[PDB]
Design a protein around this ligand. Sequence first.
Ligand SMILES: O=C1CCNC(=O)N1
Ligand SMILES: O=C1CCNC(=O)N1
Ligand SMILES: [Zn+2]
Ligand SMILES: [Zn+2]
Lengths: 151, 151
Amino acid sequence: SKWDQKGMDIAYEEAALGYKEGGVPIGGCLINNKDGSVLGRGHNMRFQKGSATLHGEISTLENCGRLEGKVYKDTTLYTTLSPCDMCTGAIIMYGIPRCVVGENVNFKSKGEKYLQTRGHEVVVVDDERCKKIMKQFIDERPQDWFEDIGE
Amino acid sequence: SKWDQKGMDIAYEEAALGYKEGGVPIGGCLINNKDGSVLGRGHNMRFQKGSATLHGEISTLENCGRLEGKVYKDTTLYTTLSPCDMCTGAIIMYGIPRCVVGENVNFKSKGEKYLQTRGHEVVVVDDERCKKIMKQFIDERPQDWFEDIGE
Ligand SMILES: O=C1CCNC(=O)N1
Ligand SMILES: O=C1CCNC(=O)N1
Ligand SMILES: [Zn+2]
Ligand SMILES: [Zn+2]
C-alpha cells in the first residue's frame, strides 16, 4: 500500500493524457511492490488506435512488454476505473496479486468481485479525480462509452 | 454448429501461419452466426510483436476492429486452444455467446467452466491438427509456452 498514492497518481496522469488525446479517460500502471519501480503505464487506446482490446489495463500490460511470469507475482496493477471482465481476466492470467482501483461508481463489472474469489486483493480508493473525468466522458459521449464496454 | 467446420478451419490456418512466423501456434476467428461471414481472424503475436496481450483470441478481436456491442451478440469465437482467463474475460465482456474450442488437452484454464457459469456455450471439437501443433510447441519450447500463460 506504500506505493498506492504513486500508482494512482500515474494512472490518473495516463487517464488525463488519454482524455486530451480524444479517448476514453482510463489509465493504469504496473508497479513492483518491493521498490516502487514502474514496469509500465498506459491508457485506453480505443479511439487513438481504433482498438477493440486496448483498454487502459491491457494497454498498460502491453507497454510493460514481454515478461517472465514470475515478474508479475509481486506487482500491483493500478487502474483509474474498476476492471471490466476482460481486464479482470488479464490480471488473473498473469497472477498480478493486487489491483488498486480509482473508482467503481461510474462503472463496475462482476470482475471486481471475481478477482477476490480468485484470491487477488482489490482496493477501491474512491478517487474523485478519476470519478470526475469518467463522469464527464460518459455524459458527453455515452455512445462511445457503451461501445468500450461492449454494450 | 453450421459454421463450425468453416470457423475452426480458418482458426487452424491462422495457428499454422503463426507457427511459420516463429510464434505460439494458436489461432482464431470471429464469425457472424446468421450468415457465416468472417468478422476477423488472427493468431498469437507474442513473438511477432513482443506482445504480452495479443493471444490468439485477443489478436482476432483486435483484427475485427471497433464494433458496436450488438454485433458481438450473435457471433461465435473460434479458438484453436481452450481460452486462458484473459481471453475468457474478453469473450464475457463483449457478450460473444458461443466459443468453439479446437482442443483443451494441451491446456485448459478455469475459464472454460467460467464461460458456462456466465451463460456462454462452449463446444470442444477435439481437433487433432490443433493438438498436434500445440503439443509440438510445448515440447520444443517449454519456456516460451510458460511465458505465454504467465507461469
Ligand atoms: O476495464 C476498464 C473498463 C473499460 N475501459 C477501460 O479501458 N478499462
Ligand atoms: O488463450 C489462449 C491461451 C494461451 N495463448 C493464446 O494465444 N491463447
Ligand atoms: Zn477492461
Ligand atoms: Zn488467452
